[PDB]
Amino acid sequence: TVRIAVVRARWHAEIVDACVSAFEAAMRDIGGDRFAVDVFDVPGAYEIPLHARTLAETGRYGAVLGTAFVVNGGIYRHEFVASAVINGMMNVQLNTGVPVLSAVLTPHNYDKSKAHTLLFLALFAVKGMEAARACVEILAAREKI
């Protein structure tokens, strides 16, 4: 059995949860009895790269999926974190040899109105399902190589 770790941000947890729940369900439908999913938490998106590296270098995981919802920020600028986190994961991926995937998303324009909170729960659930497929397909590709 191949383990996949998931590293979750705790900001806007309801949105992040919609994604991981969908991911786990999709994993059972696609690779049931082949893959197992271990979920770990971190305070937020900024800590994903390190936690993910630590898991990847442990040797227990075939893949790591980081997830988070980064928002516009209101008063403060978010762009600096969003790019640091994505590039962080890319550096980990390349130097660890583990196909770290991501669902760290930043919306064009997120309002706090319920219309938007509902939209993002549904879209994150979709991203979760897509990530499950990606995990299985990339891991298979890496055996064929």
């Binding site: 219309a115 939209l119 549904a122 879209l123 399902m129």
Partner: protein, 206 residues
């Protein structure tokens, strides 16, 4: 048991959105705009690309009171997919025995389509009290009134031929709920949310 649950839900909510879209994201944005606008019963046309994906994605609204069903199901294979992927309702444009038997075995609510008195009867013999009138426009509210006499226990959900101006014309005929789409659903997500509110208020009046 499922039929009783649903009969109460249709009486309670009155309007059912019939949703189609050209993509997964578009279907989701519309389903949310419609839900936010006050329409809780939503059918996802099942003949569209990625219908299963849309129904599973919208399961996140289930805990907020949304009921997501599978629209226009024309076969058993589609019914099986609809059942695994949520789908509280299975509805179809025509009566079908294999679909009805499948749906009973799975414990889901099935609402077959009918447009004539001989078809209403066959559907009743098979146990279906709530029927959909697929060919709306062709079969107006006059049908619903006319069939009330011989079939007082048959309730209808017309699809098509229902727009904002005929809201209450249909309910005055004895309609249970209305299968509104291509009005409620069409347009920009903000236009959709506002129209959904207009339909709900027009309906609340009757």
């Amino acid at each position: 048991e499922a039929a009783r649950k649903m009969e109460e839900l249709f009486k309670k909510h009155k309007i059912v959105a019939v949703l189609r879209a050209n993509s997964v994201e578009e279907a989701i944005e519309k389903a949310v705009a419609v839900f936010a606008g006050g329409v809780h019963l939503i059918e996802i046309t099942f003949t569209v690309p990625d219908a299963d994906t849309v129904i599973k994605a919208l399961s996140v609204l289930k805990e907020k009171g949304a009921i997501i069903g599978a629209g226009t199901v024309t076969s058993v294979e589609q019914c099986r997919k609809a059942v695994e992927s949520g789908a509280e309702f299975i509805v179809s444009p025509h009566l079908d025995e294999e679909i009805s038997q499948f749906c009973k075995e799975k414990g889901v609510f099935y609402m077959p389509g009918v447009m004539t008195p001989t078809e209403l009867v066959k559907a009743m013999k098979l146990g279906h009290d709530i029927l959909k009138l697929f060919p709306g426009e062709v079969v107006g509210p006059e049908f619903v009134k006319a069939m009330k006499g011989p079939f007082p226990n048959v309730k209808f959900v017309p699809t098509g031929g229902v727009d904002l101006d005929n809201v209450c014309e249909w309910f005055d005929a004895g309609v249970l709920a209305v299968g509104v789409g291509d009005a409620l659903v069409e347009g920009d997500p903000d236009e959709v949310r506002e129209k959904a509110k207009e339909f709900v208020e027009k309906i609340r009046g009757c």
